[PDB]
Write an enzyme that holds these catalytic residues in place. Sequence first.
Site, PDB file in Angstrom:
ATOM      1  N   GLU A  41       0.824  -1.207   0.000  1.00 45.87           N
ATOM      2  CA  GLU A  41       0.000   0.000   0.000  1.00 45.87           C
ATOM      3  C   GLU A  41       0.860   1.260   0.000  1.00 45.87           C
ATOM      4  OE1 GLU A  41      -3.153   0.462  -0.419  1.00 45.87           O
ATOM      5  OE2 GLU A  41      -4.002  -1.545  -0.209  1.00 45.87           O
ATOM      6  N   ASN A  88      -7.753   9.385  -5.238  1.00 45.32           N
ATOM      7  CA  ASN A  88      -8.627   8.496  -5.989  1.00 45.32           C
ATOM      8  C   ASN A  88      -9.444   9.303  -6.991  1.00 45.32           C
ATOM      9  OD1 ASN A  88      -7.830   6.236  -4.299  1.00 45.32           O
ATOM     10  ND2 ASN A  88      -9.148   7.131  -2.717  1.00 45.32           N
ATOM     11  N   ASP A 141     -12.666   9.522  -7.483  1.00 43.49           N
ATOM     12  CA  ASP A 141     -13.824  10.246  -6.970  1.00 43.49           C
ATOM     13  C   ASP A 141     -13.444  11.446  -6.102  1.00 43.49           C
ATOM     14  OD1 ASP A 141     -13.480   9.330  -4.180  1.00 43.49           O
ATOM     15  OD2 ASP A 141     -14.227   7.399  -4.882  1.00 43.49           O
ATOM     16  N   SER A 155     -11.575  11.444  -3.326  1.00 44.57           N
ATOM     17  CA  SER A 155     -11.084  11.088  -2.012  1.00 44.57           C
ATOM     18  C   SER A 155      -9.573  10.842  -2.083  1.00 44.57           C
ATOM     19  CB  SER A 155     -11.823   9.857  -1.480  1.00 44.57           C
ATOM     20  OG  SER A 155     -11.661   8.748  -2.359  1.00 44.57           O
ATOM     21  N   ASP A 213      -6.187   8.625  -0.123  1.00 41.34           N
ATOM     22  CA  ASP A 213      -5.707   7.578   0.775  1.00 41.34           C
ATOM     23  C   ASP A 213      -4.462   8.063   1.509  1.00 41.34           C
ATOM     24  OD1 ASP A 213      -7.688   5.968  -0.338  1.00 41.34           O
ATOM     25  OD2 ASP A 213      -6.296   4.892  -1.638  1.00 41.34           O
ATOM     26  N   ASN A 246      -8.764   5.579   3.550  1.00 37.55           N
ATOM     27  CA  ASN A 246      -9.480   6.388   2.559  1.00 37.55           C
ATOM     28  C   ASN A 246     -10.353   7.457   3.222  1.00 37.55           C
ATOM     29  OD1 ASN A 246     -10.830   7.390   0.322  1.00 37.55           O
ATOM     30  ND2 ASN A 246     -11.496   5.390  -0.440  1.00 37.55           N
TER      31      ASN A 246
END
EC number: 3.2.1.17
Length: 129
Positions: free
Chosen positions: A35, A46, A48, A50, A52, A59
């Site tokens: 990750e 991301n 949309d 958002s 991380d 998230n």
Amino acid sequence: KVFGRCELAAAMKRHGLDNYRGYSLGNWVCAAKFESNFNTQATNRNTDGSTDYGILQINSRWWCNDGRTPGSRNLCNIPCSALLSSDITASVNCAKKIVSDGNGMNAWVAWRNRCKGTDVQAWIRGCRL
Ligand SMILES: [Cl-]
Ligand SMILES: [Cl-]
Ligand code: NA
């Protein structure tokens, strides 16, 4: 902070992640490796809108507040920046809530695609725990 492999295992073990909800330590180290490359300062946006955050790439759509993900939830009740600290406590406590929500570690796409069904014990082999 960029953790060493065994350093992070011992830190995660101390914070209660070994066998948490049935997931052995190697699963968590493997997920963190893919990750974030063990970097607590990792961020990724991301599609949309958002973001991380941190060593486990938690998230902002559901789990933390970054002030710029409209209509999102803050289910870990923390600012997302707290997930970037060299102290992994906030990331670990939030990850415990994520992995308990029904879907286990499948919430981490990299764990599903790169750790699940592999020999995850190799990620803690040689470490003093
Ligand atoms: Cl393991
Ligand atoms: Cl599970
Ligand atoms: Na949020």
